[PDB]
A and B are shown apart, each in its own frame.
Chain A
């Protein structure tokens, strides 16, 4: 799940001084490995988003989001692609008719879930409506 930059502070306050170790650019594992997790979480929840509004969610200047997002595709940790003119990234969609098959199951399994809970909770009405199949 996505982790905000206010829980980054919350959790940063809990840490010990030595645990915030910085390399090269002076950024922590926390402040980079965290916000990168935020993208991957946001990816499959969304299907597309602008960099301005994305960077606003992940608490960074858009330029950064755009760039690091590219890495996570490039290095091969999250499929997708970039449209720089627009300023949009496209995520794990897998949409169209494949979605239909899941949205059938999504509701069809709720029929079995609501079935089990009537067969369980009301075993009298289970025995009553039992022969509503047989007599019909």
Chain B
């Protein structure tokens, strides 16, 4: 988890949870917190309590703070997610292994939400996206770039106008690019016929 490769932590916390399942369970109540935290931050899992040994202990009123978050993460509900952090503050925000990865987890959703919001739009205000995700403009503007840098959000920013024009303008780019090649081959071809004769 510390190293980043959550695929090698995820499976580690399933086997350790099973050893506390057989014998003593001082860590079993907090070991499932790292099995679920993996599956969310694994950015794919989103299926913890449907496994095997987590079925009868999903009810457990200690880890039920994390049961509200996995579906909130899965459904991409932020106002719900952040409400669970405020109320269940002692459960989640006191643990230093959940306090570290809290924001990286919040992003993974934030972006997810934004993708759906922008999809229908072509051009959109930053001030509106600010209010929508509920966040400072600068921080939004920043986050937008990153998605574009890694190339998930197809879009570009007009910094002066505080907006986001979105990639979409699609037309017959094939005809022109294909003909471009034919134009080039003829260029090199006719000179090869001239260099034959003298």
Please state if B125 and A82 are interface contacts (CB–CB under 8 Å). Answer: no
Contacts of A83-118 to chain B: CB distance below 8 A: 83-86
Interface size range of chain A in the complex: 10 to 19
Q: Which of B122, B125, B168: most chain A CB closer than 10 A?
A: B122
Tally chain B residues at the interface, Cβ within 8 Å.
12
Contact partner, A85, options B116, B120, B125, B168, Cβ 8 Å: B125
Contact between A86 and B119, CB atoms less than 8 A apart = no
Number of A-B contacts (CB under 8 A): 31
Q: How far is the CB of B170 from chain A (nearest CB, A)?
A: 12
Q: Nearest-CB distance from A38 to chain B (Å)?
A: 18
Contact B122 A82 (CB under 8 A): yes
Question: A75 → chain B, closest Cβ, in Å?
Answer: 10
Chain A contacts of B125 at CB under 8 A?
Answer: 84-85
B116: which A residues are within 8 A, CB to CB? 74
Nearest chain A residue, comparing its CB with the CB of B166: A81
B163 engages A81 (CB within 8 Å): no
Chain B residues 27 to 54 lying within 8 A of chain A, measured CB to CB, are none
Give CA–CA (A74, B128) in the complex, Å. Answer: 18
Distance of A65 from chain B, by nearest CB (Å): 14
Chain A residues closer than 8 Å to B123, beta-carbon distance:
82-86
Residues in B whose Cβ lies below 8 Å from that of A74: 116, 119-120
Shortest CB distance A91–B (Å):
13
Cross-chain contact B120 with A84 (CB below 8 angstroms): no
Give A80 to B120 CA distance when docked, in angstroms: 7
State whether the Cβ of B161 lies closer than 8 Å to any Cβ in chain A.
Answer: yes
Q: Could you say which residues of chain B place their CB within 8 Å of the CB of A80?
A: 120
Q: Known contacts A81-B121, A84-B123, A85-B125; can you find 10 more A-B pairs with CB under 8 A?
A: A70-B120, A73-B120, A74-B120, A82-B122, A82-B124, A84-B121, A84-B125, A84-B163, A85-B163, A86-B123
User: Which residues on A are within 8 Å of B, measured CB to CB?
Assistant: 70, 73-74, 80-86
What are 11 pairs between A and B in contact, CB < 8 Å?
Answer: A74-B119, A80-B120, A81-B168, A82-B122, A83-B122, A84-B128, A84-B163, A85-B123, A85-B124, A85-B161, A85-B163
